[PDB]
Design a protein around this ligand. Structure first.
Ligand SMILES: CC(=O)N[C@H]1[C@H](O[C@@H]2[C@H](O[C@]3(C(=O)O)C[C@H](O)[C@@H](NC(C)=O)[C@H]([C@H](O)[C@H](O)CO)O3)[C@@H](O)[C@H](O[C@H]3[C@H](O)[C@@H](O)[C@H](O)O[C@@H]3CO)O[C@@H]2CO)O[C@H](CO)[C@H](O)[C@@H]1O[C@@H]1O[C@H](CO)[C@H](O)[C@H](O[C@]2(C(=O)O)C[C@H](O)[C@@H](NC(C)=O)[C@H]([C@H](O)[C@H](O)CO)O2)[C@H]1O
Ligand SMILES: [Zn+2]
Length: 1280
């Protein structure tokens, strides 16, 4: 099964197998040849620049660009034989990186097995044809005596080096010339050779700025992209081409009218589907249907075409072998005659896998590579990566994000502020941009800084037309997605189908013409002469001079433009202070007053009562960006109250909809009885209209309105950078001039308060991004969708009077059968509106998995040390500097210490903010509290502190008081209801004594609220007759009012459901977090190699393990306990008995620290600062000759010692136990490790440690003597 990647050097000799001389498809007949190398099955690499269709002068750098983002040119790339070897070696490493993940293995396999059809729309119907440059290329094979021989070969993909532009990779199918037109077999369903132009060293860069999640220690930062994902991106385009499903219509065109508008290339639907995420909804649902239907016709044509094939131009090709392959590829069935047909259920799955399965965003996640979340995210200048062939920079299992260099965490290997050895800037000679001038003083602006705004005529109007319903009209699926996990699962189950030999007869039919290269070169810049000040002048006015000179801040934009030393600002309190030169006073108050003024100015928030949707408004947007209304100087909030959020948009969109044509009924015939399916269809197709029009509005919003709100954030980030940079330069001049005695000592505290600026500008961007994100949403959900609802209601009322005039016309066929009188009352459904869903369609009201997913409204997960919400409503999650990460139940958990900085804040999405008020909800999470000491119960036992809460006032909270766990509701009136859980006194079996436990708190309003722990009911309280609950916007995870400075907790899998869960649903939720893959220690954390552990038997938990002597046996003895009557606590003392260490039986270089079930291991006892092996000696003493007595550090000359053990988890999934299986020399089971009562030699009676196969016949017992706790020493448990 596993895919193989060939190795070679460019100098290696031609071998007529994996290294050949190729005549490429657009050199057909010309006898031009190039050395080419077979990377794997059906994929060739040609180390040459993509020159097809070009002139030599195209490769040189132009002065300016016509369209798009920046482009790097260099004619000398890939010129020499060293350059070509560098290219070849680098592509091999990138293919190896792809193969080393199962998601990339799966992608490669689909590509390889998707062979092009031998023929197309303009070939002979009865014949497989290989004579075409669309499916075959010629090659030259030399003999010993130099005697050449023309041959040919079928293939799927050929990879070349880049065209004129190095940083713009391309994928194209072969074009055919038919009746003086271009024909593409990769768009008709047949497929063809696909040709790639790829450059691995020159990569795009992006940033962090718009994202919902934010860490105050990460800040904002630029990242560069991993070339392997860039390769996979292009490979997805190849995959579409090979299945003949390439998409060329329905492009999104940018508007170019206004100056602020971005001049990009037209965005294809191909690129939006390939990238993935939310921006694939730029193509409306109705357009997705036309595409689906087009490919279905195409594949039907091919099914009929394939059925009629009886010969081929190649004698050697077995025809039946290819037909089985094409039936496999295209997912055809056979009918009873033997002709190939399209099974539509099978087609729907195939179609969805290819278009909507593999995306850049999903591959990013599987590979742990960072990507941008939006297609409109900002691009910066590209960088280059000179050392891809250095494993200290880039390796074939982790790329840049190497764990052994602490570069996996937070994608730091890609972060440009951290991993500075991995990249270098490109030299300016070859880098060209699209710039525009703004003259008033002329300033130049990069095209990358402008705003994309879509042309209106690029969106569909098919949903406003007349749809004719009949008896036999079908439903539109409305389902265009496919899980990448499902593709991997199916890939593993595949039987290994094998391709035919790919040599064929010589190729002569094609035409050696590539389409002409379309130049992006421009001679001049577009220059605009303007009267007034736009946003770009306001930002240019904030730029500091690149020189260490006296600087000042003014509130006049024109002052700052003209005067070099002066800078524009919108913070009055900060302007006052920085201009004032502090004379005769210490810097303490001087500098502090610069900082805590900037804090007070930058942190401003407010709300507008009239706008419910927007939780956060930042008033200083207007002055910073010149967003102001006539007769509202210094009054931004007044402008928002009157106009609304549309004030923020530079381009004001036309949000009207035309008349939605009412449905018509054409099925007049009532020849057959029960023609009531015509009534069903009409009602279905009415439901489809609402979804079609809703999604069309969403598409237009994304391309036209949301893009504007995104650029506001980027603009605000630039200004906050400029302002902060000005201040950090102001403060340095007054420090250099300062000639005081304290100067040398105070230097570190000055630089300490300059980092404090960055901290508060980051806190401001959190406010700003909330503001722009929620405003954009508000404008969609209110303004734009109301216009849809108006025309959708008009559409309904009209369409009923067509429906019921048809029921009246055929009224005599449905009476006297409970059908007519039933179906006036059925039109309650027609009276009800169909609601709009901005994010996730939630259903709070039989399959337990589906009920839980469908009702989840918040769900915290940690991936690569980033906490985020994976529920579907992407709530903002803010992680503060001293929130920490520790081992969790499946990954990592949040850890909270007792200081101001240790905090995680979840600002709820606007789609869910009032779900607490009147309705039921469940809260669930994993909890780990350390065992409270004797002293700390005396001191703090009274002190109640909260750990998680949503209180303003009104809300809910989770809290701890001594060894008691407390749930607390609280309404708007002030009424309080509570549950209190008293923890068990036996701390070895207690729920709040240093183990991971699963909490679940259901709330039914018309009943009681219940507390569960590990799926078991522990407390209850009556909620009935409690007022409406009005929460805070945020949910805080923090220790609050806790006097113990040493106190800490750990929280994992925080989750909120929009219903009250029943106990069957809680049982499934609890068990779903418990896997068999990784083993666990006594505390619930992952079991580890090379770590000391005390063993306790689960069946006799009061016992410790002891050693009679070295070279001898182990046995059980009682463990001391601790007791305390007045505090009501007792337990067996931990950390007595032997220490055990687990090591790998067969060690390897690169493995994890974690012990997986099924691992083969050696076990040692650590005694007297020495590690002695545990095992069974050959023919050694055993009870009943079957229960085999274990020995520690046994060594006799002749006798062997069996020591091979397997760490496994065979029973009792809820308990943190482990079993251990001993083997002999030849993989025969000597038994699981446990105990047996008896007497060795003349010793006393003891429970001696053994290995026995007896345990295998009692694995269903409640308590069993082969289950072991592995207990490490832990800070959260010490003996009193
Ligand atoms: C009871 C006993 O002594 N069992 C030990 C066993 O002895 C053999 C015979 O036992 C069976 C059995 O497993 O029950 C009888 C079955 O019919 C046999 N099944 C077959 C052939 O299909 C089965 C097999 O032969 C073996 O499993 C091997 O595959 O053995 C036992 O009945 C017999 O007893 C008599 C005999 O009838 C007469 O000739 C004469 O009166 O004397 C003998 C000796 O008593 O002898 C057989 C031996 O030749 O042999 C196995 C060897 O694998 C074990 O030693 C087994 O003892 C058990 O060993 C395990 C692992 O070492 C634990 O030590 C068990 O201890 C615990 C436990 O569950 O962990 C400790 C608990 O504290 C204890 N609880 C209490 C309250 O006492 C339990 C409890 O005794 C129960 O047995 C639990 O089910 O045991 C230990 O019992
Ligand atoms: Zn692309």
């Amino acid at each position: 099964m596993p895919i193989t990647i060939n190795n070679f050097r460019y100098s290696d000799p031609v071998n007529n197998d994996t290294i050949i001389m190729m005549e490429p498809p657009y050199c057909k007949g010309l006898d031009i040849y190039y050395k080419a190398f077979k990377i794997t099955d059906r994929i060739w690499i040609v180390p040459e620049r993509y020159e097809f269709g070009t002139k030599p002068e195209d490769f040189n750098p132009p002065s300016s660009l016509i369209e798009g983002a920046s482009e790097y040119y260099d004619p000398n790339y890939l010129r020499t034989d060293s350059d070509k070897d560098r290219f070849l070696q680098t592509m091999v490493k990138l293919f190896n990186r792809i193969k080393n993940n199962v998601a990339g293995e799966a992608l490669l396999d689909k590509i390889i097995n998707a062979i092009p059809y031998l023929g197309n729309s303009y070939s002979l119907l009865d014949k497989f044809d290989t004579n075409s440059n669309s499916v075959s290329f010629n090659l030259l094979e030399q003999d010993p005596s130099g005697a050449t021989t023309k041959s040919a070969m079928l293939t799927n993909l050929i990879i070349f080096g880049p065209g004129p532009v190095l940083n713009k990779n391309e994928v194209r199918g072969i074009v055919l010339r038919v009746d003086n037109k271009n024909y593409f077999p990769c768009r008709d369903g047949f497929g063809s050779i696909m040709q790639m132009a790829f450059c691995p060293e020159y990569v795009p860069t992006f940033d962090n700025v718009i994202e919902n999640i934010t860490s105050l220690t990460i800040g904002k930062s630029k990242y560069f992209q991993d070339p392997a994902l860039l390769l996979m991106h292009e490979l997805i385009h190849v995959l579409h081409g090979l299945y003949g499903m390439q998409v060329s219509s329905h492009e999104i065109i940018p508007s170019k009218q206004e100056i602020y508008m971005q001049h990009t290339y037209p965005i294809s639907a191909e690129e939006l589907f390939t990238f993935g995420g939310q921006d694939a909804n730029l193509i409306s649902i109705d357009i997705k249907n036309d595409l689906y239907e087009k490919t279905l016709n195409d594949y039907k044509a091919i099914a009929n075409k394939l059925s009629q094939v009886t010969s081929c131009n190649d004698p050697n090709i077995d025809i039946d072998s290819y037909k089985q392959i094409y039936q496999q590829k295209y997912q055809f069935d056979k009918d009873s005659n033997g002709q190939y047909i399209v099974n539509e259920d099978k087609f729907q799955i195939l179609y969805n896998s290819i278009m909507y399965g593999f995306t850049e965003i999903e591959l990013g996640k599987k590979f742990n590579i960072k990507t941008a979340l939006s297609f409109f995210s900002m691009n910066h200048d590209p960088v280059k990566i000179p050392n891809l062939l250095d494993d200290t920079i880039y390796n074939d299992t982790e790329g840049f994000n190497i764990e052994s260099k602490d570069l996996k965490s937070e994608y730091k290997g890609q972060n440009m502020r951290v991993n500075t050895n991995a990249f270098r800037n490109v030299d300016g000679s070859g880098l060209v941009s699209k710039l525009i001038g703004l003259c008033k003083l002329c300033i130049k602006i990069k095209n990358e800084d402008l705003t994309f705004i879509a042309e209106k005529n690029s969106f569909s109007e098919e949903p406003f037309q007349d749809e004719i319903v009949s008896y036999n009209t079908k439903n539109k699926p409305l389902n265009f997605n496919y899980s990448l996990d499902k593709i991997i699962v199916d890939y593993n189950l595949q039987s290994k189908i094998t391709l035919p030999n790919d040599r064929t007869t010589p190729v002569t039919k094609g035409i050696p013409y590539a389409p002409e290269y379309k130049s992006n070169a421009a001679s001049t810049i577009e220059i605009h002469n303007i009267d007034d000040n736009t946003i770009y002048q306001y930002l240019y006015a904030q730029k500091s001079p690149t020189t260490l000179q006296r600087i000042t801040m003014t509130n006049s934009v024109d002052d700052a433009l003209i005067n070099s030393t002066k800078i524009y600002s919108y913070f009055p309190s900060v302007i006052s202070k920085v201009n004032q030169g502090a004379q005769g006073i210490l810097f303490l108050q001087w500098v502090r007053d610069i900082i805590d003024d900037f804090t007070n100015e930058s942190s401003q928030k407010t709300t507008i009562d009239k706008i419910s949707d927007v939780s956060t408004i930042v008033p200083y947007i207007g002055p910073a960006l010149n967003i102001v209304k006539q007769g509202y100087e210094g009054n931004f909030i007044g402008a928002l109250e009157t106009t609304g959020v549309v004030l923020l948009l530079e381009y004001i969109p036309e949000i009207t909809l035309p008349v939605i044509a009412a449905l018509s009924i054409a099925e007049s015939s009532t020849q057959k009885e029960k023609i009531i399916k015509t009534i069903d269809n009409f009602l279905e197709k009415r439901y489809e209209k609402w979804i079609e029009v809703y999604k069309l509005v969403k598409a237009k919003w994304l391309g036209t309105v949301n893009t504007q709100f995104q650029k506001r954030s980027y603009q605000m980030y630039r200004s906050l950078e400029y302002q902060v940079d000005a201040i950090k330069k102001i403060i340095d001049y007054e420090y250099k001039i300062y000639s005081g005695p304290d100067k040398e000592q105070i230097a570190d505290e000055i630089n300490n308060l300059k980092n404090k600026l960055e901290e508060k500008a980051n806190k401001a961007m959190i406010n700003i991004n909330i503001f722009m994100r929620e405003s954009s949403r508000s404008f969609l959900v209110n303004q734009m969708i109301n216009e849809a609802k108006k025309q959708l209601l008009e559409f309904d009322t009209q369409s009923k009077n067509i429906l019921m005039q048809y029921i009246k016309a055929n009224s005599k066929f449905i009476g006297i059968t409970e059908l007519k009188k039933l179906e006036s009352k059925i039109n309650k459904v027609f009276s009800t509106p169909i609601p709009f869903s901005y994010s996730k369609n939630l259903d709070c009201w039989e399959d337990i998995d589906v009920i839980l997913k469908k009702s989840t409204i918040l769900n915290l997960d940690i991936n690569n040390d980033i906490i985020s919400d994976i529920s579907g409503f992407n709530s903002s999650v803010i992680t503060y500097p001293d929130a920490q990460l520790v081992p969790g139940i499946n990954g990592k958990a949040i850890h909270l210490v007792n200081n101001e900085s240790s905090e995680v804040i979840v600002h709820k999405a606007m789609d869910i903010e009032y779900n607490d008020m009147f309705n039921n909800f469940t809260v669930s999470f994993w909890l780990r509290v350390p065992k409270v000491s004797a002293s700390h119960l005396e001191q703090y036992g009274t002190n109640e502190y909260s750990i998680i809460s949503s209180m303003k006032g009104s809300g809910w909270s989770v809290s701890l008081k001594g060894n008691n766990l407390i749930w607390t509701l609280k309404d708007s009136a002030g009424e309080v209801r509570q549950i209190t859980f008293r923890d068990l006194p036996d701390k070895f079996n207690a729920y709040l004594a240093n183990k991971w436990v699963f909490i679940t708190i259901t709330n039914d309003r018309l009943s009681s609220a219940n507390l569960y722990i590990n799926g078991v009911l522990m407390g209850s309280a009556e909620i009935t007759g409690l007022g409406a609950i009005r929460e805070d916007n945020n949910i805080t995870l923090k220790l609050d009012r806790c006097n113990n400075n040493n106190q800490y907790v750990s929280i994992d899998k925080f989750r909120i459901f929009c219903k009250a869960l029943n106990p069957k649903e809680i049982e499934k939720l609890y068990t779903s977090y418990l896997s068999i893959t990784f083993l666990r220690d006594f505390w619930g954390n992952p079991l580890r190699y090379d770590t000391e552990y005390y063993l306790i038997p689960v069946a006799s938990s009061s016992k410790d393990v002891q050693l009679k002597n070295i070279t001898d046996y182990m046995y059980l003895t009682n463990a001391p306990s601790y007791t305390n009557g007045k505090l009501n606590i007792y337990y067996r003392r931990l950390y007595n008995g032997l220490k055990f260490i687990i090591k790998r039986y067969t060690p390897n270089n690169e493995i994890d620290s974690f012990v997986k079930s099924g691992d083969f291991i050696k076990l040692y006892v650590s005694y007297n600062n020495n590690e002695h092996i545990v095992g069974y000696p050959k023919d050694g003493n055993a009870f009943n000759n079957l229960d085999r007595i274990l020995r520690v550090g046994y060594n006799a000359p002749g006798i062997p010692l069996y020591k091979k053990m397997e760490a496994v988890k065979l029973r009792d999934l809820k308990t943190y136990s482990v079993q251990l299986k001993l083997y002999d020399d030849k993989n025969a089971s000597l038994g699981l490790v446990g105990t047996h009562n008896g007497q060795i030699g003349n010793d006393p009676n003891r429970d001696i440690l053994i290995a026995s196969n007896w345990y295998f016949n009692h694995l269903k017992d409640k308590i069993l003597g082969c289950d072991w706790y592995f207990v490490p020493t832990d800070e959260g448990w010490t003996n009193d």
